[PDB]
Amino acid sequence: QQPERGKIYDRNGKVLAEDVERYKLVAVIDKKASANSKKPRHVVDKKETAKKLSTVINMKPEEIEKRLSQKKAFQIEFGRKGTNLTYQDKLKIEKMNLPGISLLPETERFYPNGNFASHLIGRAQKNPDTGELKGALGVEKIFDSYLSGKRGDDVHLTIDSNIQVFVEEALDGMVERYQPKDLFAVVMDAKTGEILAYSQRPTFNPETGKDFGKKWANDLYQNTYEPGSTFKSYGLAAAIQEGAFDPDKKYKSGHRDIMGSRISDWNRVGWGEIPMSLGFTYSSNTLMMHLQDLVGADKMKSWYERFGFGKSTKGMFDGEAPGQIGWSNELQQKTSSFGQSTTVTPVQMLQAQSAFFNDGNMLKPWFVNSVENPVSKRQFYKGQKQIAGKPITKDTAEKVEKQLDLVVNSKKSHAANYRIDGYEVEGKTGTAQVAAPNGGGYVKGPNPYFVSFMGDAPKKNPKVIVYAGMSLAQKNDQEAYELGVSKAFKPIMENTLKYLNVGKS
Amino acid sequence: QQPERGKIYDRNGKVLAEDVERYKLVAVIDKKASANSKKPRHVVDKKETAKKLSTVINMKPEEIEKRLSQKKAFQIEFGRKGTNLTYQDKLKIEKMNLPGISLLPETERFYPNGNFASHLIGRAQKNPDTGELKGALGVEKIFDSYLSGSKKRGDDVHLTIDSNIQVFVEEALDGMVERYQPKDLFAVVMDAKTGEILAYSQRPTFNPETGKDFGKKWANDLYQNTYEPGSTFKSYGLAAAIQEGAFDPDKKYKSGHRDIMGSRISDWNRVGWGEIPMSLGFTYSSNTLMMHLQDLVGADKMKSWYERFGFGKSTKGMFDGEAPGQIGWSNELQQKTSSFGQSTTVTPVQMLQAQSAFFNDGNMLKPWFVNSVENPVSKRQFYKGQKQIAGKPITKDTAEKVEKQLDLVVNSKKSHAANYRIDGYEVEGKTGTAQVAAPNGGGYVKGPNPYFVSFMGDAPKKNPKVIVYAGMSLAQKNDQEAYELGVSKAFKPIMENTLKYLNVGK
Ligand SMILES: [Cl-]
Ligand SMILES: [Cl-]
């Protein structure tokens, strides 16, 4: 008898993980069991037994007989298909009155939502010999010492199951439409840093263990990306604060030659002389490279450092990646101005972006609300809003927000597909090249991109920030380049705002 | 590209784990690749391509064909079956000259021995997005931060394991599975004078190379799983009894049974042998002797004695989540049953540590399996393992008296452990035949012979080279012979082959 492992709860007290009593099928086959018995205490008719049990468990008659034919065995089991049986399965089998058949109670870890925030919650595995459960990934692993029992401590997360559903359904949709190699979405409270929802694909099912181990890495904290143009917002912020960005001032668009590489605006030719505000709305690489020059390379590196890049956010997830600011030569510096070369985690991106909606204060993202024992009522840990740094002034944040509004809402916008009928949205898109894992350079192909969007709503005074990213669509890659992650952002954001009771127009 | 992950080595420099180059199958299906080409550069005949590829990747032609038929796709990959392909698979596929088909180089973790010391070495898993490898169990996990080159080459971990001895253990355990199909099974070989783990394996287990069965049992039997050890535990009560003056080998004691707190506790043969000498009682693995010695020594002292032998506390090895076990001492029944290894739970590493005292003048040796952690480029040594005394619970004199009784257990005329003898070598040890606690609910597992059978042996007797401890829990086949022969069919080949390998005179 193990102590009961603590539960994992969402922010509203809904169970995400708990221990339950299930049942294991056992069949006595040795004749000795019926030696001194009135009625047989072993399986006498193997074919009839296999026929009846085949209706309850997920096994074909022939395989049941095969197992029942084990020689020199007193008792036999039926693998995982004979265990984790529900109480209804127990009654169903016991009503048959099959000689030698019985059900033994056994404890299992249950995830009521199945595949749901899987890479965050994780999975606990059971040692058959003792029944001991041990976390192998995510919260189950991180908090294993508290969760393990007396009775184990409960862990309460900031996740809201209602919002989590919107994310799971939207990611399922992106997989069917685009079959990408990697995909994630996260919803964060813009004013507190709480993670309200988080999912990724591909992922696993904690309940059944399907696909567990195929990808150990949690995308939010452990996987790294060349973020692309969502990263332009931090270069814009620096330039605003340094006095280098003036929205009405004209600048030369087109291309720049650097260390042998031809870096141009996404449309090749650029737009000639245009205002910097418009340059940002168009996601101009030349604008960012010029702003970098106006501010200075040394100062820009420090700017990205003050925005938390290249350092872990110090969250409670295990093995959080620090990423790295790519600044070794002018080519890395210049490509870093539009989010290539430099690598980041999604949690760093959320942390940095929060500065624009909190008077310049970055909020440390958090997903653990509480670790507490339900018997003693002792609270071992309580999460809270915490400032990660204040890299910019309130004035600078307001000016950045003005440009984010324009990105989506300008008459010359190239991100109109992120608009949600009845709501005001703002944000920044990214369309990045992806580094080939076996070195060399970038992944080749028709549209080999990591597409993403960092959005918030209602604009100016947001309730939530939604960050979604999709790496390397293997299907409909053209549409993925065209629409980015709009097909995930729109339903996630619209459903979330409604659930949070934000007025529609 | 990721830095190279460090290697895991056995004590002689043989590779147990390393990074290698393997290949991923890629198929171009879009017409565009052949727009300006004399020959096709995309898959033109999907049915034939699927037929020919099915000969290398373990995938049915209809499935390959289905995957090749995906709409709005440029390139097709084939999941796990299309990755980790060998250089030989690569040449075989390339020789087919299939339009649109190519092999991409990729890094994979390679375990040359396959299923071999699996629960000790562990397995590293690969994040396909970046290629980053991360340890998920065992040494791969414990030393992940050293092994990975990103926390630029990673550091190597050298173990005390000897692959030659390990082969003997893997073969013996395979034999026990075939014969008895037990629920759990382990064997460990330790250098009797240094505490170095020379070999270690368990069943069921997994294959680190393929990941087959990985996750079915997270627990390493040596450090994490706990057992009610049975009569192998009698040796520590004997040692305590000897040092306190309670054990006189010539002195007589009355055997049979004892009614403790309502329950009737008797010797394995039910009737006992009546009034007999103590020395003979230990040879017969008498429960009445141990219960009587507990009384002579006193309950408070015995608990303390088990504590000084390291029970109830982690040995402080480098394995993650080492279990402390516990001494069952809440009431007289638990106290008395602990005299013969029930109620009390232990790890096998604790058992090895305690047993080592009898062959090292009373000093327990802390078992160890990590020989060094060092970077092969800089030559920096981060850690170096060594022999360390875990405590000296007994005197040189007491250790010698215990060894005298262990000798008799196996070599006395009236021995019931003759099946553990090895022709040509002098062996000694103690047998165990314990009841096993049911995972859910109370009481012990039911059945005709629901036992955890074990043997803690050493050889050559008195001056042993190695200690071999093996245990088998709940045979599901030949449970009768499991009860009669214990783990003799594992101990004999493991010990005999190990002694020959270590050049011990026969
Ligand atoms: Cl947190
Ligand atoms: Cl060690």
What are the tokens at A219?
């995308």
Q: What share of chain A is helix, strand, coil (3-state, %, to 5)?
A: 35, 25, 40
Nearest CA-CA distance, residue A448 and chain B, Å:
11
Per the CB < 8 A criterion, the answer to whether A198 and A220 are in contact is: yes
What residues does B190 pair with on adjacent strands? B197, B467
Kindly report the three-state secondary structure assignment for every residue of B1-56: CCCCCCCEECCCCCEEEEEEEEEEEEEECCHHHHCCCCCCCCCCCHHHHHHHHCCC
Q: Alpha-carbon distance A67 to B476, whole Å?
A: 12
Structure solved via: X-ray
What is the CA(A385)–ligand 1 centre distance, in A? Answer: 10
Residue found by looking up tokens 């309850």 in the block = A56
Query: How many of the other CB atoms lie within 10 Å of CB of A425?
Result: 26
Beta pairing partners, B177: none
Residues 6+ apart with CB under 8 A from B285: B231, B234, B268, B409, B416, B430, B431
Q: Are the C-beta atoms of A478 and A449 separated by less than 8 Å?
A: no
CA nearest neighbour of A26 among B447, B442, B480, B483: B447
- Catalytic residue ranges of B: 231
DSSP state, residue B445: P
* CB-CB under 8 Å, B477 with A72: yes
CB A440 within 8 A of CB A448: no
- Rounded to the nearest angstrom, the distance between the alpha carbon of B372 and the centre of ligand 2 is 9
Cα separation, A265 vs A328, in Å, equals 23
What distance separates the 2 farthest-apart alpha carbons in chain B? 101
Cβ–Cβ of B129/A104 closer than 8 Å? no
> CA B239, B242, B246, B252 torsion: positive or negative?
positive
Q: Contact A370/A157 with Cβ under 8 angstroms?
A: no
**Is the peptide bond preceding residue B204 cis, with omega within 30 degrees of 0?**
yes
Ligand nearest to the CA of A220: 1
**How many angstroms separate the CA atoms of A37 and B4, rounded?**
66
Neighbours of ion ligand 2 (CB under 5 A): B 318, 368-370
Sheet bearing A195-201, strands edge to edge:
A195-201, A180-189, A464-473, A449-457, A426-433
For residue A224, give the nearest of B32, B107, B130 by CB distance.
B130
With vertex at residue B210, the alpha carbon angle to CA B377 and CA A142, rounded to the nearest 5 degrees, is 75
Inter-chain touch A213–B217, beta carbons under 8 Å: no
Other residues' Cβ atoms within 10 Å of the Cβ of residue A367: 25
3-state secondary structure of B71: coil
Of B431, B232, B426, B418, which Cα lies nearest the Cα of B339? B232
Q: With the C-alpha atoms ordered B328, B331, B333, B339, is the resulting torsion angle positive or negative?
A: positive
Q: How far apart are CA A17 and CA A109, in angstroms?
A: 7
The single residue of A148, A199, A229, A277 carrying the catalytic annotation is: A229
Q: What is the 3-state secondary structure (H, E, C) of B341-406?
A: CCCCEECHHHHHHHHHHHHCCCCEECCECEEEEECCCCCCEEEECCCCEEECCCCHHHHHHHHHHH
d(CA B479, CA B449): 6
Beta-carbon neighbour count of residue B382 at 10 Å? 12
Tell me the DSSP string of A115-167.
SSSHHHH-EEEE-TTT--EEEEEHHHHHTHHHH---BPPEEEES--HHHHHHH
Distances (CA, A) of B471 to A175, A185, B341: 49, 49, 14
Sheet holding B451-459, edge to edge: B197-203, B182-191, B466-475, B451-459, B428-435
* Nearest chain A residue to B218, by CA: A127
Are A283 and A429 in contact, with CB atoms under 8 Å apart? yes
One-letter amino acid for residue B430 of the chain? K
**Kind and range of the H or E run holding B157:** strand B156-159
Give me B215's structure tokens: 């996750």
Output phi, psi for A332, to 5 deg: -65, -40
Structure tokens at A211: 């696909």
Q: Which two tokens stand for residue B297?
A: 């020594």
Instruction: Tokens 């591909």: give the residue.
Output: A202
The two three-digit tokens of residue B237, written as one number:
């009560």
Q: Is B274 exposed, middle or buried (0-12, 13-18, 19+ CB in 10 A)?
A: exposed
CB spacing of A215 vs B127 below 8 angstroms = yes
- Classify each residue of B337-350 as buried b or exposed e, where b means 16 or more C-beta atoms within 10 Å of its C-beta: bbbbbbbbbbbbbb
Smallest CA–CA distance from B205 into chain A, residue: A127
How many helices and strands, by DSSP H and E, does chain A display? Answer: 16, 20
Interchain proximity A107–B217, CB inside 8 Å: no
Strands B156-159 and B8-9: parallel
In 3D space, the residue among A246, A225, A208 whose CA is nearest the CA of residue A399 turns out to be A246
b vs e for A301-323, b when ≥16 Cβ sit within 10 Å of the residue's Cβ?
A: bebbebbbbbebbebebebbbbb
Which amino acid type is present at position B216?
Answer: K
The span from the CA of A52 to the CA of A62, in Å, is 12
Name the burial class of residue B99, with classes exposed (0-12), middle (13-18) and buried (19+) by CB atoms within 10 angstroms of its CB. Answer: middle
SS3 of residue B470 by DSSP: strand
> How far away, in angstroms, is B367 Cα from ligand 2 center?
7
List, in sequence order, the alpha helices (H) in A143-249. Answer: 144-147, 161-178, 232-242
Cis check: omega of the bond before B460, within 30 degrees of 0: yes
From residue A322, alpha-carbon distances to A232, A309, A439 in Å are 19, 8, 20
Q: CA nearest A279: which of A246, A309, A310?
A: A246
> Which residues in chain A are contacts of B447 at CB distance < 8 A?
74-75
Residues forming beta bridges with residue A432, ordered by sequence position: A450
Alpha-carbon radius of gyration of chain B: 28
Beta carbons of A209 and B226 less than 8 Å apart: no
Give the separation between CA A237 and CA A38, rounded to whole angstroms: 86
Ligand nearest, relative to CA of residue A369: 1
Q: Can you tell me the distance from the alpha carbon of A180 to that of A479, in angstroms, rounded to the nearest whole number? A: 12
Tell if the CB–CB gap between A105 and B441 is shorter than 8 Å: yes
What distance in Å separates the CA atoms of residue B440 and residue B280, rounded to the nearest whole number? Answer: 38
Burial of A139 (0-12, 13-18, 19+ CB in 10 A): buried
Give me A60's structure tokens: 């074909």
Gapped junctions in chain B, after residues (C–N > 2.5 Å) = 151
Go through chain A and list every residue after which a break occurs, taking a C to next N gap over 2.5 angstroms, comma-separated.
149
CB contact under 8 A, B225 and A129: yes
Tokens linked to A241: 């604060």
DSSP for B231-286, written as a single string:
GGGHHHHHHHHHHHT---SSSEEE-SEEEETTEEEE-TTSS--SEEEHHHHHHTT-
- Angle in degrees, 0-180, between the axes of helices A232-242 and A394-409, rounded to the nearest 10: 130
How many A from CA of B384 to the centre of ligand 2? 9
Largest CA distance in chain A: 100
CB B348 within 8 A of CB B369: no
User: Distance from the CA of A87 to the center of ligand 2, in angstroms?
Assistant: 45
Which contacts qualify for A77-84: CB closer than 8 Å, 24 or more apart?
A77/A24, A77/A25, A77/A26, A77/A27, A78/A25, A78/A27, A81/A57, A82/A24, A82/A25, A82/A57, A83/A22, A83/A23, A83/A24, A83/A25, A83/A108, A84/A22, A84/A108
Distance CA B280, CA B250 (A): 9
Question: Backbone phi, then psi, for A156, in 5-degree steps?
Answer: -105, 125
User: How many of the other CB atoms lie within 10 Å of CB of B51?
Assistant: 13
Distances (CA, A) of A487 to A298, A417, A430, B390: 39, 9, 15, 63
| Residue located via tokens 């038929």 | B69
For residue A202, say if its preceding peptide bond is cis, omega within 30 degrees of 0: yes
Question: What sign does the CA torsion over B334, B335, B338, B340 have?
Answer: negative
Backbone phi, psi, residue A35, to 5°: -60, -50
Torsions phi, psi for A252 (to 5 deg): -85, 110
What is d(CA A319, CA A107) in angstroms, rounded to the nearest whole number?
30
How far apart CA B347 and CA B88 sit, in angstroms, is 44
Cβ neighbours for B338, distance < 8 A, ≥ 6 positions apart: B233, B306, B327, B328, B329, B344
CA separation for the pair B223, B197 (Å, rounded): 12
Q: Taking a C-beta distance cutoff of 8 angstroms, is the pair B148, B5 a contact? A: yes
Of B489, B501, B426, nearest to B455 (Cα)? B489
Distance of alpha carbon A134 from alpha carbon A146, whole angstroms: 11
Name the CATH superfamily for A161-495: DD-peptidase/beta-lactamase superfamily (3.40.710.10)
H or E, element range at A495 = helix A486-499
CA torsion angle A79 A83 A85 A87 (round to 10): 140
Which residues in A88-102 are b (16+ Cβ under 10 Å) and which e?
Answer: ebbeebeeeebbbbb
- Copy the structure tokens of residue A91: 């009654």
Pick the CATH number of B164-502 from 3.40.50.1380, 3.90.1170.50, 3.20.20.70, 3.40.710.10: 3.40.710.10
Q: Which of B296, B390, B280 is nearest to B339 (CA)?
A: B296
**What gap in Å lies between CA A433 and CA A360, rounded to an integer?**
30
Burial label for B63, CB within 10 Å (0-12, 13-18, 19+), is middle
List Cβ neighbours of A328 (8 Å cut-off, separation of 6 or more).
none
DSSP state of B116: S
User: Which residue does chain A place closest to B477, by CA atoms?
Assistant: A73
CA dist B185 and B453 (Å) reads 10
Provide the H-helix boundaries in B284-347. 287-297, 299-308, 332-338
Task: Count Cα neighbours of A496 within 13 Å in the Cβ-side half-sphere.
Answer: 38
Q: Give the pair of three-digit tokens for residue A397.
A: 């944040």
The span from the CA of B303 to the CA of A365, in Å, is 50
* A-B contacts (CB, under 8 Å): 124
Question: Smallest Cα–Cα separation from A309: which of A244, A217, A227?
Answer: A227
Q: Is the dihedral of CA A321, A326, A327, A328 positive or negative?
A: positive
Cα–Cα distance, A177 to B263 (Å, whole number) = 68
HSE-up (13 A, CA, CB side) for residue B168:
25
DSSP-based three-state secondary structure for A269: coil
Give the Cβ contact number of residue A173 at 10 Å: 13
What's the rounded Cα separation, in Å, for the pair B216 and B224? 15
Q: Contacts of residue A182 in chain B, CB cutoff 8 Å? A: 129
CB–CB contact A474 B131 (8 Å): no
3-state DSSP of A416-471: HHHCECCECCEEEEEEEECECCCCCCECCCCCCEEEEEEEEECCCCCCEEEEEEEE
Residue B34: Cβ-neighbour burial (10 angstroms; 0-12, 13-18, 19+): middle
- Cα A25–chain centre separation: 37
Q: Which of B130, B180, B186, B472 to mutate to test the interface with A (most CBs of A within 10 A)?
A: B130
Tell me which residues have their CB within 5 A of the ion that is ligand 1. Answer: A 316, 366-368
Minimum distance, in Å, between the CA of residue A296 and any CA atom of chain B:
30
Q: Is B81 exposed, middle or buried (0-12, 13-18, 19+ CB in 10 A)?
A: middle
Q: What tokens were used for A63?
A: 């395989």
CA B368 to centroid of ligand 2, rounded, Å: 4
Q: What are phi and psi of B439, to 5 degrees?
A: -50, -50
Q: Which residue, A187, A83, A118, is CA-closest to A489?
A: A187
Q: Enter the tokens of residue A207.
A: 């309940």
Q: Do residues B102 and B90 make contact, with C-beta atoms less than 8 angstroms apart?
A: no
Strands A154-157 and A8-9: parallel
Among residues A49, A137, A166, A159, the alpha carbon closest in space to that of A97 is found at: A49
Dihedral, CA atoms, B214, B218, B220, B225, nearest 10 degrees? -150
